[PDB]
Amino acid sequence: SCPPCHGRPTCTKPGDNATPEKLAKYQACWELLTCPPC
């Protein structure tokens, strides 16, 4: 469930400029901070 860090989206934006599922990316990405990348 950890994202590959060889060319990943940074998705650091909190979804302020986002409203639809477009923010779901960032939301999920933010939760992925629980898993440490390379």
Coordinates of C-alpha atoms in Angstrom, one line a residue:
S1 CA 0.0 0.0 0.0
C2 CA 3.1 2.2 -0.2
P3 CA 3.6 4.3 -3.4
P4 CA 6.8 3.8 -5.4
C5 CA 9.3 6.7 -5.1
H6 CA 11.1 6.4 -8.4
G7 CA 8.9 9.0 -10.1
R8 CA 5.9 9.6 -7.9
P9 CA 3.3 12.4 -7.6
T10 CA 4.3 14.7 -4.7
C11 CA 0.6 15.5 -4.1
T12 CA 1.4 17.9 -1.3
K13 CA -1.5 20.2 -2.1
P14 CA -4.3 19.8 0.5
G15 CA -7.1 20.0 -2.1
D16 CA -7.8 23.7 -1.7
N17 CA -7.8 24.2 -5.5
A18 CA -9.6 20.9 -5.7
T19 CA -13.2 19.9 -5.0
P20 CA -14.2 16.7 -6.9
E21 CA -12.5 13.3 -6.6
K22 CA -9.5 15.3 -8.0
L23 CA -8.7 16.1 -4.3
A24 CA -9.1 12.4 -3.3
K25 CA -5.6 11.9 -4.9
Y26 CA -4.1 14.4 -2.5
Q27 CA -6.2 13.2 0.5
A28 CA -5.0 9.6 -0.1
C29 CA -1.5 10.8 -0.8
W30 CA -1.4 12.8 2.5
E31 CA -2.4 9.6 4.3
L32 CA 0.4 7.8 2.6
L33 CA 2.8 9.9 4.7
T34 CA 2.4 7.1 7.3
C35 CA 4.6 5.0 5.1
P36 CA 8.2 6.3 4.7
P37 CA 9.5 6.6 1.1
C38 CA 13.1 6.1 -0.1

